[PDB]
Design an enzyme around this catalytic site. Structure first.
Site, mmCIF file in Angstrom:
data_model
loop_
_atom_site.group_PDB
_atom_site.id
_atom_site.type_symbol
_atom_site.label_atom_id
_atom_site.label_comp_id
_atom_site.label_asym_id
_atom_site.label_seq_id
_atom_site.Cartn_x
_atom_site.Cartn_y
_atom_site.Cartn_z
ATOM 1 N N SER A 153 0.854 -1.177 0.000
ATOM 2 C CA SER A 153 0.000 0.000 0.000
ATOM 3 C C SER A 153 0.891 1.229 0.000
ATOM 4 O O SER A 153 1.787 1.364 0.837
ATOM 5 C CB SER A 153 -0.933 0.014 1.209
ATOM 6 N N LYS A 179 0.291 6.097 15.343
ATOM 7 C CA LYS A 179 1.024 7.059 14.527
ATOM 8 C C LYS A 179 0.793 8.483 15.013
ATOM 9 O O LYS A 179 1.743 9.269 15.144
ATOM 10 C CB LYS A 179 0.616 6.914 13.065
#
Lengths: 426, 98, 182, 48, 49, 49
Positions: C45, C88
């Site tokens: 991805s 993240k």
């Protein structure tokens, strides 16, 4: 002499020995058994560390051996020319039976012989479900073990009597128990994590229907995209070239390329390179059967045609444009209908599937009742041109038709590449 | 083309679901005429044979149900007879003689 | 696998080639490399960071370093979801706080991940105080215009600037081809 | 020899022409399953 | 667009933190009605699940 | 031991309920017999509403 324990052979004299070829190759006894059949004689197994044994005269064999197994299990034995030399008679059990009322009565009698109590409606519903499990309208599944298991489950839910409603409950429970993956998928779609356009138009984006092979049988939509770039005639299928796939010329890729090139010859160099990809993954691809979704998405990208996202597109396509049948059409259509229902039916969603699969369509009663209500329209097509015309809504005729716009897009790409080649000569 | 409901409606129309139904059991390998004829040939001729088919077809159940209905000539009694403590031959006798 | 195609590379190449057809024979090769390793790459991805960095490299766009970016993208440009958005965002917020927050630090995350944002109490408090900002985007265009700080169309339009950069590469290649006559 | 055996069983004690024809037809018919499925698919329109 | 704190605020509003809670134990497999119903079917029918 | 008793096999009248991760059952689900024996699948949804 009194320690000889009879085996299978020592009990079938003048009778029938029923064996499992799967076991025969799993225990590696097929060589010895085949040798025994060759000899027409056999001795009991002798332990090689007992010199004070018995030199038993081989026991004569006078019996019909009837092997049993799957077609896949017999190729391991069909290499031996002695195998066809011994077993001259092959009885092939048809995976399907003719779906006729005589067979319905036979199924009812068989279930009654199994000890079930079923009403006529329950028998009818089981017969319908067997036909659906065979995935053809006029051939009911012969896998009577599965029908017996389904009848068991319906009896437990019905209290002991296979009333029709109990059978629908058993079928719904069968779907529901292995429904977890689809529950997660639908919940994600509602939550927006996996956004599938089920309304409006989009250019180059189509809602293909795939069967997840990261999971058991469950049709679900996957948003398939195709983008056109001016350049070579090379066609890249990203899901089929994610690695060790670009060195193999996949039949699907070549089929799409052939249809695209031979369909349009005014720029027969195919000035357009087509990139085909799937949004996200859980997408499993045949890689050997080009999908009608890919072809229509590529054509829309080439001609900048807004395809309807309402209607899902499934089907395997041939380079002539003749749409072929695809396995497990029912699962795909049911999955797309479920996704449409979770987002709420707008009365315009539908599915475009080959006319060849018309005899494979046995949809769940919810989809049928939606269709009769004019809320979910199943479109059957013969060639990719019809499917493209349905998606775009317009025809191949008149001013600013689909063919004209595809020609215009290819011409624009051709002139852009010609200008680029002018830059490579100046 | 847009399929109508009638061309899509495949469920057999349910008439009655309030009464139990009694039906004679179907003959073994019902709707399976290929297997029946092949087994009849393999039985009359006494040929070795093999059944093939997808799993969960009830091949064992149907095959055993069909074979038990078959009538075969009365098999002779076969038994090991020791001519010594090292040699054991095979003896055949009429039925019920062992 | 230095001779094997990757889904991320093909995805980005398809997006870039499709989005700029006035140079379809993409005249520029882009190198994507992660400063420092400990970088564990999905390899299946293409991150929105990769695409926006490539676009800024093409168009000579000064991207804002205040905001982080994350998210996978298709070959159409639709910013998809990625796993563990919380980790993240928390990591970037910690890195910002250790260097001292200034009220402009932020994260670019797909709107698809909105149903996954379960940020810690400290991050939520920083947002409520206007010290840390979360921008949710849906298509790569929105993220690019947020980072660049300007709109795609109009004066100094980002699309126009990328077109200018690609045209500069094209004219440079033409000038090089002028030497190919000899 | 095997085909003659199959014909004899179908005739019972004699290899008449009809018995040989029936035995050959049965040879074809026992392994006819794949072609039966193919023809059924063609008729049903699954394969056109 | 910059998400507001209100849109990103997901913690349940804590009302009281001073008194113990007294709640009856939940039914087994709570929120797992799929597994619960599957086991119901496996138990009433005595299948292997 | 050559003194083994000719023990009659013990009949089984119980419901077997296998437990394991989806990864573990992938190996066994391959077998055509496994789906025939264990046919009630009880899945535990990793999340609750």
């Amino acid at each position: 002499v009194s320690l000889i324990r009879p085996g299978a052979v020592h009990r079938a004299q003048g009778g029938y020995l029923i064996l499992d070829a799967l076991s025969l190759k799993r225990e590696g006894t097929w060589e010895a058994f085949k040798r025994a059949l060759r000899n027409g004689q056999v001795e009991p197994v002798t332990e090689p560390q007992a010199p004070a044994g018995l030199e038993v005269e081989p026991f004569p064999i006078q019996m019909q051996v009837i092997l049993v197994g799957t077609p896949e299990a017999f190729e391991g034995l069909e290499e031996d020319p002695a195998f066809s030399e011994l077993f001259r008679i092959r009885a092939e059990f048809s995976p399907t039976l003719p779906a006729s009322p005589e067979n319905c009565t036979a199924l009812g009698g068989w279930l009654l012989a199994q000890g079930f109590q079923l009403t006529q409606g329950g028998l009818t519903r089981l017969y319908d479900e067997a036909r659906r499990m065979a995935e053809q309208r006029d051939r009911m599944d012969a896998r009577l073990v599965e029908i017996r298991a389904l009848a068991e489950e319906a009896a437990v839910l019905g209290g002991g009597l296979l009333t029709a409603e109990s059978v629908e409950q058993a079928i719904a429970a069968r779907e529901h128990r292995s429904f977890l993956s689809e529950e997660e998928f639908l919940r994600a779609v509602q939550e927006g994590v996996i956004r599938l356009r089920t309304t409006g138009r989009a250019v180059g984006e189509v809602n293909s229907l795939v069967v997840v092979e990261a999971a058991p049988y469950w049709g679900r939509p996957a948003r398939l995209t195709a983008r056109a770039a001016p350049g070579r005639d090379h066609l890249i299928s990203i899901d089929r070239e994610a690695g060790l796939g670009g060195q193999i010329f996949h039949k699907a890729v070549l089929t799409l390329a052939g249809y695209l090139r031979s369909r349009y010859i005014e720029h027969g160099s195919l000035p357009v390179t087509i990139s085909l990809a799937f949004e996200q993954n859980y997408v499993s691809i045949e890689g050997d059967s080009a999908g009608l979704a890919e072809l229509v998405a590529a054509l829309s990208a080439i001609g900048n045609l807004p395809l309807r996202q309402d209607l899902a597109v499934t089907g395997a396509v041939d380079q002539t444009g003749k749409v072929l049948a695809v396995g497990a059409i029912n699962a795909k259509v049911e999955g797309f209908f479920r996704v449409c229902k979770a987002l709420g039916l707008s009365g315009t969603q539908g599915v475009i599937l080959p006319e060849a699969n018309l005899a494979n369509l046995t949809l769940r009663a919810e989809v049928l009742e939606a269709v009769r209500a004019g809320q979910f329209h199943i479109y059957a097509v013969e060639t990719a041109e019809q499917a493209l015309e349905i998606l775009a809504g317009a025809r191949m005729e008149g001013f600013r038709g689909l063919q004209e716009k595809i020609r215009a897009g290819l011409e624009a790409f051709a002139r852009l590449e010609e200008g680029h080649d002018k830059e490579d000569r100046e | 083309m847009r399929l109508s409901y009638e061309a899509l409606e495949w469920r057999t129309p349910i008439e009655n679901s309030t009464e139990p139904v009694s039906l004679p059991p179907p003959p073994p390998f019902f709707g399976q005429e290929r297997a029946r004829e092949a087994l009849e040939l393999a039985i009359r001729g006494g040929f070795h044979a093999y059944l093939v088919g997808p799993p969960s077809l009830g091949k064992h159940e149907a095959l055993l149900a069909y074979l038990s209905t078959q009538s075969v000539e009365t098999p002779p009694d076969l038994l090991y007879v020791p001519l010594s403590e090292r040699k054991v031959a095979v003896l055949t006798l009429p039925s019920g003689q062992e």
